[PDB]
Amino acid sequence: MPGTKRFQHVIETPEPGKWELSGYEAAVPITEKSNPLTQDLDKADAENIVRLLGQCDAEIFQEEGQSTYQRLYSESILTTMVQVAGKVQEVLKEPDGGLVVLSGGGTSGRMAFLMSVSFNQLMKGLGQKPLYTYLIAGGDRSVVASREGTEDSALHGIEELKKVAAGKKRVIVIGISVGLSAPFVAGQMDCCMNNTAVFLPVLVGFNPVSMARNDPIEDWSSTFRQVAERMQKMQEKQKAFVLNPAIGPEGLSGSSRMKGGSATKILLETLLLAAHKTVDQGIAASQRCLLEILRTFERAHQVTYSQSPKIATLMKSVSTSLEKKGHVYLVGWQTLGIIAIMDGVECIHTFGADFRDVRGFLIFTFSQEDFLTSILPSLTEIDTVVFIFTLDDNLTEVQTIVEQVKEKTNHIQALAHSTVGQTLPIPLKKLFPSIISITWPLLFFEYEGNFIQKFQRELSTKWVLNTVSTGAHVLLGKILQNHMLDLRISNSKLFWRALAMLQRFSGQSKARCIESLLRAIHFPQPLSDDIRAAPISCHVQVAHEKEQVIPIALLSLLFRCSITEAQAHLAAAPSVCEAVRSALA
Ligand SMILES: Nc1ccc(S(=O)(=O)N2CCN(c3ncc(C(O)(C(F)(F)F)C(F)(F)F)cc3-c3cccnc3)CC2)cn1
Ligand SMILES: O=P(O)(O)OC[C@@H](O)[C@@H](O)[C@H](O)[C@@H](O)CO
């Protein structure tokens, strides 16, 4: 029947009370789940939110129990990290025609970028040709843009991979997809396996292979699950690798920008730093080298969230300025400005927020005086600005821009990273009464740029800005339980999430939910057979452009009413959220 082909794989809604015993819950991949810690995220205050998201982030480093899934510290995972380090070593020894590609969509793509930079720096500072590069769904401009739509083509992913791998003789393709989900990566990984004389595919993500995505990809015949399952078979013979520790669900369900992005850094920095630092020692990388780095990254979470009350504040101030109708600027130097841009840009798709709402700036990439003459002008009593720099940066360029901004705002706060017993120029740096001073022990670093110190700092900042940005929006009443209900359906995955959110919140059948969602999307056109049988891309292309699609469909189901009636109901409510909450009653 029409639709059947497209919706066959969707599990039916369970009868109430049997969500567990139906085996529905067991079919939800770890990455897609509701985190139980955050069931009441919507109710928590800023200080609680920082606690709950810190707890959620800590789960990355939690160990395996005694019938269960491998984690970051499990032996099978560190073993794989070791073997991959080795394969990376082979390439570093023979850099003529070698290349290392890091590839993902969205934040996996953004993370790919940073790490390609860092490791390209590392080899530069040793007078080696840079062997790293990146790939992001939608080309290089995707790095600083909200472009959720571009990850759904496998032929695209393969094309971008053919370009960059030229007439190289030996390529390592690290495909990053947190959910083991992105058609962009799946095609890349599959092509790799079809030419193993040249390619070594290494898949990174945070679900068991058995929970890998399995609905059809429009321009490709295999599914992510098939591709991954076949990569796991090749791992015996050491010609593919799958690096897939569980780290537990995201605090905002499906928000893989957060733990997934962090885990991607932790996991990949760790393993690549090990590979480099141990080739010129003439020693194989060993579990023990990896562990040193991981434990350090794990200290970094403790250090970072020991500043929790100061973090909670910056949240409250960021939230205040958006409650009014202000704007928020995240001004940061080098690498950490980038992290800043990336957080701000991610607020657009994640929260359906305007590019002005949380903006990032690097010293998007503006000069000292340029920021001074351009952006400075429209700052205002209500806004918040954030300064993110180390004490190693060039604090004269810093002190200026804050001196100036002080006069227009007064809601400044800052984020400063320091080696132990560095001091903060200007003893009346007040300026910042209540700095977020994050201060780092001395570690023994032998590489010129102190990369471990860099990585730690990036991560700690990421953690702060993610918690700040995410918490700010929750506080504004925009998150339902721990779900972003009102998301813009901008790719198939979000489409599948919308449908799931309707089954879960409504409790009604799969057919009904599907009908209400498709009616909501294509309103005012009615459901025809063509529309039922259409490929998910056609629904995505049309939903991408509307507002409140999911809430409209949810009300049509709760009220057992038409779209015409549910739009009218919503318009005559004080807000979207109250319309939804009161109707969920
Ligand atoms: N490994 C992956 C990744 C993505 C996908 S997906 O794009 O096809 N889609 C992802 C999200 N997804 C779900 N999203 C949300 C839910 C919820 O129930 C939960 F509470 F768990 F978050 C929600 F309440 F939000 F709806 C469930 C799923 C889900 C449901 C059943 C099977 N698989 C995923 C459906 C599958 C499938 N497999
Ligand atoms: O790495 P995945 O599971 O393939 O996810 C890829 C992207 O969709 C993901 O990074 C998304 O853009 C983020 O907004 C999620 O917070």
Instruction: Give one DSSP letter per residue of 66-88, joined into a string.
Output: -----BTTSHHHHHHHHHHHHHH
Domain that holds residue 585: 489-585
Q: Where are the beta strands (DSSP E) in 137-196?
A: 170-176
Token pair of 216 as six digits: 């059809």
End-to-end CA distance of the chain: 35
Tell me: is residue 3 an annotated ligand-binding position.
no
The CA radius of gyration of the chain, in Å to the nearest whole number, is: 24
CB 474 within 8 A of CB 319: no
Number of compact structural domains in the chain: 3
Residue 10 in domain: no
Residue 559 in domain: yes
Distances (CA, A) of 559 to 15, 196, 480, 527, 582: 19, 56, 19, 19, 12
Q: Does residue 87 sit in the same domain as residue 129? A: yes
3-state secondary structure of 176: strand
Q: Does residue 433 sit in the same domain as residue 448? A: no
Give the residue carrying structure tokens 């890091």.
102
Distance, CA of 104 to CA of 203 (rounded, Å):
10
Q: How far is the CA of 243 from the centre of ligand 2 (A)?
A: 17
Tell me: is residue 178 an annotated ligand-binding position.
yes
Distance, CA of 242 to CA of 154 (rounded, Å):
19
Q: How far is the CA of 262 from the centre of ligand 2 (A)?
A: 12
Protein residue with least CA distance to atom 8, ligand 2: 106
Q: Does residue 197 sit in the same domain as residue 260? A: yes
CB 254 within 8 A of CB 217: no
Q: Does residue 482 sit in the same domain as residue 541? A: no
Among the candidates 406, 426, 441, a domain finishes at 441
Q: Does residue 288 sit in the same domain as residue 349? A: no
Report whether residue 496 contacts ligand 1, using a CB cutoff of 6 Å. yes
* CB burial readout 442-475, b (16+ within 10 A) else e: eeeeebeeebbbbbbbbbbbbbbbbbbbbbbbbb
Q: Return the H-helix or E-strand segment holding 255.
A: none
Q: How far is the CA of 178 from the centre of ligand 2 (A)?
A: 7
Token pair of 401 as six digits: 């821009």
Amino acid in the structure at residue 577: C
| Resolution of the experimentally solved model in angstroms | 2.4
DSSP string, 556-573: HHHTT--HHHHHHHHHTS
Among the candidates 462, 488, 514, a domain finishes at 488
CB 573 within 8 A of CB 585: no
Tell me: is residue 378 an annotated ligand-binding position.
no
3-state secondary structure of 262: helix
CB 213 within 8 A of CB 189: no
Give the residue carrying structure tokens 């991610």.
346
Q: Does residue 75 sit in the same domain as residue 206? A: yes
CB 269 within 8 A of CB 115: yes
Report whether residue 11 contacts ligand 1, using a CB cutoff of 6 Å. yes
* Separation of CA 167 from chain center: 32
Supply the DSSP symbol for 148: G
Distance, CA of 583 to CA of 70 (rounded, Å):
41
Helices (H), 59-145: 75-93, 106-124
Protein residue with least CA distance to atom 31, ligand 1: 28
Task: Give me the CATH number covering residue 254.
Answer: 3.40.50.10490
Q: What are phi and psi of 418, to 5 degrees?
A: -150, 140
Report whether residue 148 contacts ligand 2, using a CB cutoff of 6 Å. yes
Ligand closest to Cα of 36 equals 1
Report whether residue 177 contacts ligand 2, using a CB cutoff of 6 Å. yes
Cis peptide before 524 (omega within 30 of 0): yes
Tell me how the structure was determined. X-ray
Q: Does residue 299 sit in the same domain as residue 338? A: no
Residue 42 in domain: yes
Supply the DSSP symbol for 63: P
Cis peptide before 431 (omega within 30 of 0): yes
Angle between helices 563-571 and 549-558 (to 10 degrees): 110
- Using a 10 angstrom Cβ sphere, with 0-12 exposed, 13-18 middle and 19 or more buried, the burial of residue 373 is exposed
Q: How far is the CA of 32 from the centre of ligand 1 (A)?
A: 5
Q: What are phi and psi of 361, to 5 degrees?
A: -140, 135
- Using a 10 angstrom Cβ sphere, with 0-12 exposed, 13-18 middle and 19 or more buried, the burial of residue 532 is middle
Of 545, 315, 531, the closest CA to residue 436 belongs to 315
**Would strands 241-243 and 199-204 be described as parallel, antiparallel, or unpaired?**
parallel
Q: How far is the CA of 82 from the centre of ligand 2 (A)?
A: 26
Tell me: is residue 179 an annotated ligand-binding position.
yes
Report whether residue 483 contacts ligand 1, using a CB cutoff of 6 Å. yes
Q: Does residue 449 sit in the same domain as residue 507? A: no
Protein residue with least CA distance to atom 30, ligand 1: 28
Q: Where are the beta strands (DSSP E) in 234-286?
A: 241-243
Q: How far is the CA of 220 from the centre of ligand 2 (A)?
A: 20
Report whether residue 298 contacts ligand 1, using a CB cutoff of 6 Å. no
Q: Return the H-helix or E-strand segment holding 291.
A: helix 287-305
Distance, CA of 511 to CA of 283 (rounded, Å):
59
Q: Does residue 348 sit in the same domain as residue 477? A: no
Q: Does residue 298 sit in the same domain as residue 406? A: no
Report whether residue 33 contacts ligand 1, using a CB cutoff of 6 Å. yes
3-state secondary structure of 253: coil
Q: Does residue 240 sit in the same domain as residue 379? A: no
Protein residue with least CA distance to atom 16, ligand 1: 500
CB 472 within 8 A of CB 346: no
Tell me: is residue 109 an annotated ligand-binding position.
no
CB 462 within 8 A of CB 33: no
DSSP string, 314-352: HHHHHHHHHHTT--EEEEE-THHHHHHHHHHHHHHHHHT
Contacts (Cβ under 8 Å, ≥6 apart) of 28: none
Token pair of 412 as six digits: 């400044």
Protein residue with least CA distance to atom 11, ligand 1: 497
Supply the DSSP symbol for 298: H
Q: Does residue 370 sit in the same domain as residue 434? A: yes
Of 532, 554, 541, 423, the closest CA to residue 486 belongs to 554
Distance, CA of 273 to CA of 576 (rounded, Å):
48
